[PDB]
Design a protein around this ligand. Structure first.
Ligand code: C3D
Ligand code: C3D
Lengths: 229, 227
């Protein structure tokens, strides 16, 4: 995990990429319901992706749950934003569900505009796929690391070590891209600062989503899988 | 501002530093916490505007954009200042030199949630051995970055460009401070990343804090003070 190279980190992350799911509705024939159903089906695939992120399965089950519980919406959003890059003014929730801002207006066209603005920023920066997977992995490991005993000290230290490896990977990606050393840390800073805005969008999103099993135990169930398959 | 060297950026930032204010309560009478915190924050905000106008490149922006940036960042700025002066006080938050509270004093009203988050941030700074030169850079970054994604006119395009160019200068400054600290190129980029990722948590704390306060528009008060 901590012994991988930069290119091995990239190859591991890309291969771990979840598939693009479709909205469940009749194309031969309500928006929140569609987005909710889409989000829930994506969460299942997100857990599989998370377990394939180098260093994540090295953590305790409790800490895995905590990290995903903190980051799951940010992860959905940055994925959505990535999907929507070459669709200006629109959000590609699914290949059969492409929406403009005046569609999402029918009470949160607010985060719609915020997601669009993020996509435009990624389009302005010419974000690459190898950079995207790095950023998404960073969100997974970092979003909940500040909100967690001897075990916790080792866990947090391990997390920060993996984050450092991803940072080195990002630098390597930009160094190979021909960027000067100054352009490297500048682009690094620009990419990470965007994560603060994605955190912001998640907060506003969760403010809207807020009997049912608490999300932690659902995450617990999907993460704590046996070895019989 | 874009012509400033790294050391000139630091000295300018350090000079622009706001004063540490005191809680307005009488120490001679016995010991409402939120009121004390609210009063302190409002007095700090006035000084924050002075600090903001002395951050390189900020006055180069339109009044409207200055208001937008501050309205988005003001709570984050108050918070990172809080955890900075609380860094040498483990398990406690130094709101003011005469107002030092532990986490049990946080249960005042149905806020200890934000308290623990602030405490956790201060311990993270303490473990990283955050330097004063780094602190002022990060705080300036919050000011310029927090609201830059929530502004399409020709004017606004030039505004966003300038902001991102100043942000780059702060990034250059941070690396220069780490390189002058004796850190290798690998460690420089790693520490840069660690510091900026903390800002995501500060944004998080701000949002949680705003949710508390939400339960005379600020832009008008900011506009009044900025002009
Ligand atoms: O690729 C994606 C699929 C669906 C979405 C998004 C990305 C971006 C946020 C959207 C959003 C809409 C309204 C409010 C907040 C965010 C929507 C979305 C809809 C519903 C959601 O929550 C469903 C509840 N469900 C319970 C456990 C996990 C989620 C999350 C995201
Ligand atoms: O150095 C500082 C002085 C005071 C504070 C803080 C830092 C960190 C946040 C604190 C907080 C406690 C509970 C909930 C949210 C935040 C408290 C604080 C209290 C009240 C505040 O809001 C006052 C309202 N006022 C109207 C216009 C501007 C603020 C801001 C910050």
């Amino acid at each position: 995990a901590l012994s991988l190279t930069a290119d091995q980190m990239v190859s591991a992350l890309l291969d771990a990429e979840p598939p693009i799911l479709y909205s469940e509705y009749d194309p031969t024939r309500s928006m929140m319901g569609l987005l909710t159903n889409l989000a829930d089906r994506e969460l299942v695939h997100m857990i599989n992706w998370a377990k394939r992120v180098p260093g994540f399965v090295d953590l305790t089950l409790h800490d895995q749950v905590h990290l995903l519980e903190s980051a799951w919406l940010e992860i959905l959003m940055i994925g959505l934003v990535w999907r929507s890059m070459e669709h200006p003014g629109k959000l590609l929730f699914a290949p059969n569900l492409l929406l403009d801002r005046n569609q999402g207006k029918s009470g949160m066209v607010e985060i719609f505009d915020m997601l669009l603005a993020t996509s435009s920023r990624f389009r302005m920066m010419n974000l690459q796929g190898e950079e995207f997977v790095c950023l998404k992995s960073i969100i997974l490991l970092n979003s909940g690391v500040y909100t967690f005993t001897l075990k916790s000290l080792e866990e947090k230290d391990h997390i920060h070590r993996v984050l450092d490896k991803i940072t080195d990977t990002l630098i390597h990606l930009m160094a190979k891209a021909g960027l000067t050393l100054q352009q490297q840390h500048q682009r690094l800073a620009q990419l990470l600062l965007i994560l603060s805005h994605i955190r912001h969008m998640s907060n506003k999103g969760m403010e809207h989503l807020y009997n049912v099993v608490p999300l932690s135990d659902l995450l617990l169930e999907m993460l704590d899988a046996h070895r019989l398959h």
